[PDB]
Amino acid sequence: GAMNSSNYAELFNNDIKLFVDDTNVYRVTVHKTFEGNVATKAINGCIFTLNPKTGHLFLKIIHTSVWAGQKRLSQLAKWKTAEEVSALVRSLPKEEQPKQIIVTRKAMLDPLEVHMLDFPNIAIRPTELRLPFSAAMSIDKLSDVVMKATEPQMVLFNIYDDWLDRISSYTAFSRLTLLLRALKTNEESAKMILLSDPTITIKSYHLWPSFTDEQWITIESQMRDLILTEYGRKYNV
Amino acid sequence: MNTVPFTSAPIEVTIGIDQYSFNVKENQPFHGIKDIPIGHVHVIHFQHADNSSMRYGYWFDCRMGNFYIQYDPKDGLYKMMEERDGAKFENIVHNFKERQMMVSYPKIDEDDTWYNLTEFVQMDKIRKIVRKDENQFSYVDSSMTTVQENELSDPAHSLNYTVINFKSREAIRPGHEMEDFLDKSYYLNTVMLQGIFKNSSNYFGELQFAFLNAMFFGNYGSSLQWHAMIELICSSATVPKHMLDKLDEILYYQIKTLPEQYSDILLNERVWNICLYSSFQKNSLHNTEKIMENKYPELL
């Protein structure tokens, strides 16, 4: 059934599961033509497939070439997502195949379901959570690899860097969703907070700065304040 | 013109035959229905005055034998039986007609409703959906479940309709996931029409039989099956033009015949709004669309 606040901790048990977010699969700039009409230009996108327990991210890069000569692209994008997720599953050894896949947008349930007909013991699940996974392209290294890609390419990352050496999945995921949520609500400030201190670097094999534990607490506080502020501004509360 | 005699009417029951029905009082001297038009299937059906639950009845064809109704006081219902002794049966029948204890199948001569509802329904096919091969007629009731419904429990009493499932391997070719699910032409024409039903007439027959089971017995699984077979046609971009025109006629007479007060449970909002307004064949159901709008514009 649908994932929500109630069954939140199931994400961190030992049932392999993956989130699939398709928000950045079909990405366009909207521009005017010489005649003054509007036209879109596709840019590279990605499927964001993430094992919330382990931090393993399967960043399937969606090259603009996949759209060439295709109609109804925002609809196709959901089927292409589902096709690529299915191929990822098929590519994994059996014991690595997920028991659940939780799509972050309900529009993905049927495409994925139909693509997973060969895997009837894999539950395709919606979620009531407003996960901020769309802000994945606010992570510099992820945005860079997508933008530079010249072909379809799968790129593997651990979205938790090394956090799990010191914290739990649950905390790791909460740290991640807070960073991304702040990146989503005010990217510029969120990134400012992350690099304001030139002395805290991002390791070449990491996505996020190498904060000590105390510095993560301060960071998390700064992201929480950021998110709260933006809310008042949005609503005049 | 054929007869179905009744041994007695021991319990107060509303009897129907096809789209007609009569109130019959406890031990009222009622002894059959006469002038039943040869050439179509028929259904005689019952709803006891005391148990407005469980509508039940018998599908039959008078060419396939001589049938009569007898109340069973053990099992508590009007049972259809077959009389093998042709003479003993013409005897019973002629004696009841003479005593005029029989209702006349009340067909208006201008009226093609029953033909139109049963155009494609064959008793040989009914008897495959309702498996009971020691009887030439077929028992159906309100509560019988379908083969699909059971999968998701007694198989002897099941409605073996053709399973239709839009998210199945049957329905979706590997490699045409998106195509075949958005455009069921493959599943309809190759899997179902060419593959399972053999032709459109067997398909329309099952569709029509499913509608009638829903209408006369409120069999919920028949309703599901009727809606599935419509949706599969309406969701196919490529349908023979003859099936499209016939379908509009079929559905017209079905919508025309439904009791008005039942449109809420018999008619599935999503399927109809999709078929009439969103599907490939939105514009191919002119008669069905016109009556639906002028008669149930709420659902839409």
UniProtKB/Swiss-Prot annotation, chain A:
Query: Outcome of D21N?
Result: Reduced growth at 30 degrees Celsius. Strongly reduced growth at 16 degrees Celsius
Q: Where in the cell is it found?
A: Nucleus
Q: What are the boundaries of the region RNase H homology domain?
A: 7-237
| Cysteine disulfide partners in this protein | none
Task: Tell me what else is known.
Answer: Present with 468 molecules/cell in log phase SD medium.
Its domain description in UniProt is:
The MPN (JAB/Mov34) domain has structural similarity with deubiquitinating enzymes, but lacks the residues that would bind the catalytic metal ion. Contains a region with structural similarity to reverse transcriptase, presenting the classical thumb, fingers and palm architecture, but lacks enzyme activity, since the essential metal-binding residues are not conserved.
The UniProt function text for this chain reads: Functions as a scaffold that mediates the ordered assembly of spliceosomal proteins and snRNAs. Required for association of BRR2 with the spliceosomal U5 snRNP, and the subsequent assembly of the U4/U6-U5 tri-snRNP complex. Functions as a scaffold that positions spliceosomal U2, U5 and U6 snRNAs at splice sites on pre-mRNA substrates, so that splicing can occur. Interacts with both the 5' and the 3' splice site, as well as the branch region. Has a role in branch site-3' splice site selection. Associates with the branch site-3' splice 3'-exon region. Also has a role in cell cycle.
Q: How does it assemble?
A: Component of the U4/U6-U5 tri-snRNP complex composed of the U4, U6 and U5 snRNAs and at least PRP3, PRP4, PRP6, PRP8, PRP18, PRP31, PRP38, SNU13, SNU23, SNU66, SNU114, SPP381, SMB1, SMD1, SMD2, SMD3, SMX2, SMX3, LSM2, LSM3, LSM4, LSM5, LSM6, LSM7, LSM8, BRR2 and DIB1.
The name on file for this protein is Pre-mRNA-splicing factor 8
Q: Which organism is it from?
A: Saccharomyces cerevisiae (strain ATCC 204508 / S288c) (Baker's yeast)
Its taxonomic path starts at: Eukaryota, Fungi, Dikarya, Ascomycota, Saccharomycotina
- Gene symbol of the encoding locus: PRP8
Which part of the full protein does this chain span, and how long is the full protein? Answer: 1836 to 2069 of 2413
UniProtKB/Swiss-Prot annotation, chain B:
Arranged from A to Z, the UniProt key words for this protein are:
Cytoplasm, mRNA processing, mRNA splicing, Nucleus, Phosphoprotein
**Highest taxon in the source lineage:** Eukaryota
The GO cellular component terms are: cytoplasm; U5 snRNP
Q: Which InterPro entries does the record associate with it? A: AAR2, AAR2_C, AAR2_C_sf, Aar2_N, AAR2_N_sf
Maturation and modification = Phosphorylated on serine and tyrosine residues.
Q: Name one GO biological process term.
A: spliceosomal tri-snRNP complex assembly
Ranges where the record places region Leucine-zipper: 244-265
Chief location category:
cytoplasm
Which Pfam families would you find in this protein's record? AAR2, AAR2_1st
Add the further remark from the entry. Answer: Present with 7330 molecules/cell in log phase SD medium.
Q: What name does this protein carry?
A: A1 cistron-splicing factor AAR2
Q: Give the organism's phylogenetic lineage.
A: Eukaryota, Fungi, Dikarya, Ascomycota, Saccharomycotina
What gene makes this protein?
AAR2
